[PDB]
Amino acid sequence: VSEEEWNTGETYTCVVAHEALPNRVTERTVDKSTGKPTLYNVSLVMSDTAGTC
């Protein structure tokens, strides 16, 4: 695909139809943000740390 399409972040999904799979079909996807991405932008937030119960 054109690098512009990849730079857009459009997800591409590949399917494999084969006997051994449970329901005979499996899929995986990749985009600009998950294929060996340069940057991991995380905003981890925790609230009510105590939270007794």
Q: Give the footprint of ligand NAG on this chain (CB under 6 A).
A: 39, 41, 43
CB-wise, 14 or 45, nearer to ligand NAG? 45
Spatial contact of 48 and 23, defined as CB atoms under 8 Å apart: no
Rounded to a whole number of angstroms, the minimum distance from the CB of residue 9 to ligand NAG is 10
User: Of all residues in this chain, which one has the CB nearest to ligand NAG in the complex?
Assistant: 43
Comparing CB distances to ligand NAG, the nearer of 21 and 30 is 30
Phi, psi of 13 (to 5 degrees): -120, 135
Closest CA to 32 of 1, 5, 50, 14: 5
